[PDB]
Amino acid sequence: VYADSFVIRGDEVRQIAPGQTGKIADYNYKLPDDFTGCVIAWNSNNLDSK
Amino acid sequence: SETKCTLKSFTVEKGIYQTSNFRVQPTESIVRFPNITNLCPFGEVFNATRFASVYAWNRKRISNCVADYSVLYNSASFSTFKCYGVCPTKLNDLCFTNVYADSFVIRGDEVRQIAPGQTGKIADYNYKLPDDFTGCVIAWNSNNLDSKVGGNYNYLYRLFRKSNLKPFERDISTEIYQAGSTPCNGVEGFNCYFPLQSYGFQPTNGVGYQPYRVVVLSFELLHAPATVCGPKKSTNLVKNKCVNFNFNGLTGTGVLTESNKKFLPFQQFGRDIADTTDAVRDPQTLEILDITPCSFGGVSVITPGTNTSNQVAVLYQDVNCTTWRVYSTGSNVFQTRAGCLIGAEHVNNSYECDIPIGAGICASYQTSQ
Amino acid sequence: FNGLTGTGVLTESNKKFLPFQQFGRDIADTTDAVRDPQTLEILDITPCSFGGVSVITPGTNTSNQVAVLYQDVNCTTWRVYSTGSNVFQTRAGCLIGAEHVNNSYECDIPIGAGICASYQTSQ
Amino acid sequence: SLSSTPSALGKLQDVVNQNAQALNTLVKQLSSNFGAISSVLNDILSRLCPPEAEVQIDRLITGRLQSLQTYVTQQLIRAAEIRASANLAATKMSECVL
Amino acid sequence: PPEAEVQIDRLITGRLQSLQTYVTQQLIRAAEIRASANLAATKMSECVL
Amino acid sequence: CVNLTTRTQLPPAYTNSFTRGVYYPDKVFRSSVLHSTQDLFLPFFSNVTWFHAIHVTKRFDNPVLPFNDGVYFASTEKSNIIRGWIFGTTLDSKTQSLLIVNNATNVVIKVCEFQFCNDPFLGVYYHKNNKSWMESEFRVYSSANNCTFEYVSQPFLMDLEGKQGNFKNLREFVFKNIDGYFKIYSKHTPINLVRDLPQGFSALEPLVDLPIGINITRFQTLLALHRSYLTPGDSSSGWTAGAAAYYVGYLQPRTFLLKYNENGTITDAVDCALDPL
Amino acid sequence: GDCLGDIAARDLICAQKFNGLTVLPPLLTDEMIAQYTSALLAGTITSGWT
Amino acid sequence: MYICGDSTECSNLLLQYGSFCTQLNRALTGIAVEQDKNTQEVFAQVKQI
Amino acid sequence: MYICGDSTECSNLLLQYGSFCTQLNRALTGIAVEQDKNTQEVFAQVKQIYKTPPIKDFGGFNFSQILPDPSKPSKRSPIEDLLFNKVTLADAGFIKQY
Ligand SMILES: *[C@@H]1O[C@H](CO)[C@@H](O[C@@H]2O[C@H](CO)[C@@H](O)[C@H](O)[C@H]2NC(C)=O)[C@H](O)[C@H]1NC(C)=O
Ligand SMILES: *[C@@H]1O[C@H](CO)[C@@H](O[C@@H]2O[C@H](CO)[C@@H](O)[C@H](O)[C@H]2NC(C)=O)[C@H](O)[C@H]1NC(C)=O
Ligand SMILES: *[C@@H]1O[C@H](CO)[C@@H](O[C@@H]2O[C@H](CO)[C@@H](O)[C@H](O)[C@H]2NC(C)=O)[C@H](O)[C@H]1NC(C)=O
Ligand SMILES: *[C@@H]1O[C@H](CO)[C@@H](O[C@@H]2O[C@H](CO)[C@@H](O)[C@H](O)[C@H]2NC(C)=O)[C@H](O)[C@H]1NC(C)=O
Ligand SMILES: *[C@@H]1O[C@H](CO)[C@@H](O[C@@H]2O[C@H](CO)[C@@H](O)[C@H](O)[C@H]2NC(C)=O)[C@H](O)[C@H]1NC(C)=O
Ligand SMILES: *[C@@H]1O[C@H](CO)[C@@H](O)[C@H](O)[C@H]1NC(C)=O
Ligand SMILES: *[C@@H]1O[C@H](CO)[C@@H](O)[C@H](O)[C@H]1NC(C)=O
Ligand SMILES: *[C@@H]1O[C@H](CO)[C@@H](O)[C@H](O)[C@H]1NC(C)=O
Ligand SMILES: *[C@@H]1O[C@H](CO)[C@@H](O)[C@H](O)[C@H]1NC(C)=O
Ligand SMILES: *[C@@H]1O[C@H](CO)[C@@H](O)[C@H](O)[C@H]1NC(C)=O
Ligand SMILES: *[C@@H]1O[C@H](CO)[C@@H](O)[C@H](O)[C@H]1NC(C)=O
Ligand SMILES: *[C@@H]1O[C@H](CO)[C@@H](O)[C@H](O)[C@H]1NC(C)=O
Ligand SMILES: *[C@@H]1O[C@H](CO)[C@@H](O)[C@H](O)[C@H]1NC(C)=O
């Protein structure tokens, strides 16, 4: 069991999934097509914005 | 060993076993795409000053370009992107034929309707996408472009219609809709309605009421000459060898040779009796090539029991032995009517049959055996 | 009927449905009866198609005349494709498009139930 | 008589036709999609990724195995009929010839 | 269609399987009947004629 | 627009479609093979309506016909009289419709909220001076608002000369309107006929696939008129019907067994629903 | 018309026909078999085994 | 009739399996023919009535 | 080859069905073996290969159409040669090269 963690823009959340393309899926964080696990995300506008 | 694995045993009894087929591997790959040098009009499709009303959407033809989607990475951000044909990770390995980009502006809550199987004002009266669909639907928020403080009323949608639209139809007429029994001869009274309404797009609207720009990219794959290709680099064409290949997105393994087939001008691929591609027209030189599978077959093994010795002879049914498509020459080559037998001595003494091979020939283990 | 679609021939039925039953079914769980939504009449549903068709063919390298046998037609609208003006009723079906002769012969193309056919003479 | 009437040997011609048609059938049956988007494995693989591609490939694998099982069953049935004929022929050789 | 065709295909495959089962059983039975018929034919020649 | 007069009253003729109406159903090459396929095809030996233009009993047929989900159209010509078609629903400026014409210089395809003429036509005037046949009138529509599709071919010069003798050119087309696309298949075959359609077999090849997006329920055929020094100067009666004919059939879902020869040409076909044989 | 009329019977023969299952007649009818059997007996009785 | 029951959508989907239906009937036809042959082998040995 | 056609991804997926492929070939092998057994049961009943004597009279009985014809490349009787030229086989040898 491992927990990967990072911050991205809301429109890019859709890329953290098997089979996706885009800046994150292709160059920053590629999740495999064969994947067991859960992807969880939440808004942090009041924490990570200035 | 192949026989041992097939039989799930570490011991093999005396006799003949079949052992798959003689196969060869490809040594290099060939990639052939038409030499299209222009980049697709991503700017015009996605960076347009104005988009059409959903009731009267645009349909632009795209051809003779390279679909390098990465040009959008430092500019656009999309909230929605979904492909109903190809998995997005493979778009760059393919070529496309009848490629069109439909475009319009709708409210955010209506974005969910641009999909197969949906209902609602857009899906039923403005833009119906077919149940059988190949393409990708892409959309993004345009609140800072398409909204005005007093309301941007330049975007219209159809609210009233008598029946639902069929796929990709447009209806831009402005007849008065009759809801009741009244003839509605330009009346627009209690039971008569003008069919179109504007969206009040304002910068302070909540998200579901903000405008979204929608682009639908329709396409067809692998059955016609390419006009649009992804950004793959081509290679040289290698003939008369077992190779891997990609011809306009169609991949496979085989031996490419010159063909005497003539294709009609609109035919890109040809097929055999089992509907398997067996010929292609090369994308840069319009030469027809035939494709023959690399593998062929006819292999079996003559085995003394393994509890006696590990010497075996191998029969190649489709090899004449007068590179023979054999695993080893073996220095003991006997051609029979049943195949080329390698690894057995040929003697002139006839005997009672022991391990039958075929076509009048048998084998045995005999004497220094 | 209330969202349940299909194709068939609707006829009056002698079935009685319990008050809570809207549809009835056969041994293959296929609806075979409905209660009409406005008039509470029970209707039976019979499939439109039925069957029994075969073609008697002289080789096509000789002629294109054929005769058609209808196994489930008595011919005495007959549920046939054409009357043909040459109608012979046999125990194997209604044979349309063949002449009936009183000369017995050795069997050539067997039809069934003692009847055979052949192509013979202006043939 | 044998020269004049070719049908005399229909019994032997029939076993070389039937066991040839059987293989031509297996090749032709490869064109069926068996519920898949395409009968060609390469189209499935060039357009789809594993989470979906494996479903389409499995539809074809199951269908092709079914075709092969059908073939084998028919050949086993035919083989039994041939054996019976061969046993009769062997009996006649002993009782009519020897 | 995107879903309906899956459900329809499940039924088509199942019905073809039922028909293949039927045909295979009839072929096996037919072989047994033929053997009986050959015996009967033999007896007609050897017991009656 | 002009309302034409001086036409006699005749019943429609009917003919036998025989084995016409097959088109290549794919864009894949295959050869020396029989292939079974299902599509909308003209049924074999179907009832084809025969329309005719002839001066003589003056006849000039340009009726509105139903489209019925797919149309087989064919014509026999000696002198380029059939010029085009109108496809749509009401054809009265309320909805969009498709106009496909050959105006002797360009092939023009437009989709607009056209208001069509009751008797749409094109025409050619014969100048006895210098013996010339020239394109003159073009009626067809009174208005064309809110155009969404437009194409014009490169220029060409069509031969507008009137001709004597038999028909020399057989043109066949198949029109379909599926999922927003107007598909056209076609073939041009040399002929030598006095009347009616020839028997024989030829498959049509795809020509265009137009991204139109409109509803087509009816269509109308556009014929050219001939005018000359020999006719009255009145625009409704001052005309010649020339000599041309066309045939209209309708497509139905059918299964065909198509025969491809060694070079991948369809040479024959079986209509699987024609009869038990 | 016999299967359509007599619904109540729930005749298995009609159920089979409506589902495409067809039973075909034999070429030799019982009357023809009877003639062959009678011929064999006449032969056996008047010209036994010849 | 067995598989689709005259449903049009099924009939079109079933086209891809048409080669299997043809094979099923070739087998049944072969059985049906043998049944008449069996009858003749047993009862039609003497052609003099 | 029948199922995957050398597609690598299919070949790996097909591994789960390997026990079915093995079973199909055991059945086919069993048939193939029986075919040679049938031939021997019918024709190899006598293991003494008796030579036809130089022809001497048989009392007027002429067996030349059943006895092998020595002038032929294959020692078949006139009748056998006729039988061989009437039944037509699918191929004419067992070697077909790539
Ligand atoms: C395509 O056009 C036809 C003709 O205008 C439309 O069909 C008519 O629909 C109205 C409203 O239900 C009926 O009162 C008419 O009787 C119909 N006419 C005919 C000839 O069928 C059809 O609905 C249109 N297609 C679409 C998708 O809107
Ligand atoms: C293998 O190929 C040869 C040709 O290269 C085939 O033909 C025979 O070749 C030998 C060469 O030593 C000649 O002596 C024979 O006369 C040739 N035979 C004929 C009929 O021309 C040979 O048949 C092939 N082998 C097999 C098993 O097919
Ligand atoms: C076809 O229907 C008739 C009744 O309409 C069946 O019955 C015979 O009809 C004929 C009419 O000419 C009479 O002469 C016979 O006497 C009737 N037979 C009996 C037993 O009553 C006829 O059997 C039906 N045909 C078939 C093949 O079933
Ligand atoms: C056939 O139609 C075309 C298209 O409408 C006509 O060409 C146009 O003519 C106008 C008037 O001179 C020009 O302003 C346009 O620019 C032309 N369009 C194109 C694409 O060139 C053409 O003149 C017509 N020909 C005949 C004989 O009627
Ligand atoms: C068996 O019969 C054949 C005829 O069927 C004899 O062969 C013929 O012999 C004569 C010479 O006496 C030749 O002129 C003929 O051409 C031969 N005919 C054929 C078909 O070859 C044969 O000699 C006889 N053998 C015996 C032992 O009687
Ligand atoms: C859209 O315009 C901006 C400038 O406003 C530019 O930086 C961006 O690259 C353009 N996007 C595309 C796809 O051309
Ligand atoms: C470019 O395409 C043309 C036409 O298909 C072809 O003849 C040519 O060899 C290609 N390559 C280059 C470098 O021009
Ligand atoms: C309305 O429903 C009733 C009860 O089901 C029925 O008897 C009647 O015929 C229906 N139609 C009208 C017009 O009332
Ligand atoms: C032609 O006649 C119709 C009535 O049948 C009329 O509505 C139309 O306006 C007339 N057109 C012209 C050009 O006179
Ligand atoms: C249809 O064709 C037949 C000939 O097969 C002809 O007798 C009949 O009059 C035609 N009717 C129509 C409406 O075309
Ligand atoms: C022929 O003469 C007429 C005048 O009568 C003129 O209008 C026409 O353009 C001339 N044709 C040619 C080809 O010059
Ligand atoms: C249709 O034409 C009218 C003018 O008659 C115009 O006001 C309206 O905006 C046009 N509609 C479209 C979709 O172009
Ligand atoms: C096929 O093409 C070749 C080469 O042009 C030609 O000789 C042959 O006659 C053609 N065959 C047919 C059936 O058209």
Residue numbers in the entry:
A (entry chain B): 395 to 444
B (entry chain C): 297 to 618, 632 to 676, 689 to 690
C (entry chain A): 543 to 618, 632 to 676, 689 to 690
D (entry chain A): 937 to 1034
E (entry chain B): 986 to 1034
F (entry chain A): 15 to 70, 76 to 296
G (entry chain B): 838 to 887
H (entry chain B): 740 to 788
Provide the authors' original text about this structure.
The S-protein is a glycosylated, homotrimeric type I transmembrane fusion protein responsible for host cell attachment via its receptor binding domain (RBD) to human angiotensin-converting enzyme 2 (hACE2), a process that is enhanced by a coreceptor, cellular heparan sulfate. The S-protein is made up of the S1 domain (residues 1 to 685) containing the RBD and N-terminal domain (NTD) and the S2 domain (residues 686 to 1213) housing the fusion machinery. Clinical candidate monoclonal antibody J08 binds the severe acute respiratory syndrome coronavirus 2 (SARS-CoV-2) S-protein independent of known escape mutations and is able to potently neutralize most variants of concern (VoCs). A relatively small epitope footprint high on the receptor binding domain (RBD) ridge and the ability to bind multiple conformational states of the S-protein contribute to strong neutralization across several variants.
For structural studies, we generated the following two constructs based on SARS-CoV-2-6P (six proline): one with the RBDs restricted to the down configuration by introduction of an interprotomer disulfide bond at positions C383 and C985 (Mut2) and a second with unrestricted RBD movement but higher stability, containing an interprotomer disulfide bond at C705 and C883 (Mut7). Single-particle cryoelectron microscopy (cryo-EM) analysis of two complexes, SARS-CoV-2-6P-Mut2 + fragment antigen binding (Fab) J08 and SARS-CoV-2-6P-Mut7 + Fab J08, resulted in four cryo-EM maps and associated models, as follows: SARS-CoV-2-6P-Mut2 trimer alone (3.2 Å), SARS-CoV-2-6P-Mut2 + Fab J08 conformation 1 (3.4 Å), SARS-CoV-2-6P-Mut2 + Fab J08 conformation 2 (3.4 Å), and SARS-CoV-2-6P-Mut7 + Fab J08 conformation 3 (4.0 Å). Although Fab J08 has nanomolar affinity to the trimer, the short incubation time during sample preparation for cryo-EM enabled reconstruction of a trimer with no antibody bound, serving as a comparator for our analysis with J08-bound structures. Finally, we find that the alignment of the RBD-J08 X-ray structure onto the ligand-free SARS-CoV-2-6P-Mut2 model reveals the same clash with neighboring RBD and glycan N343, and highlights that even in the down-RBD models there is some degree of structural rearrangement and opening at the apex.
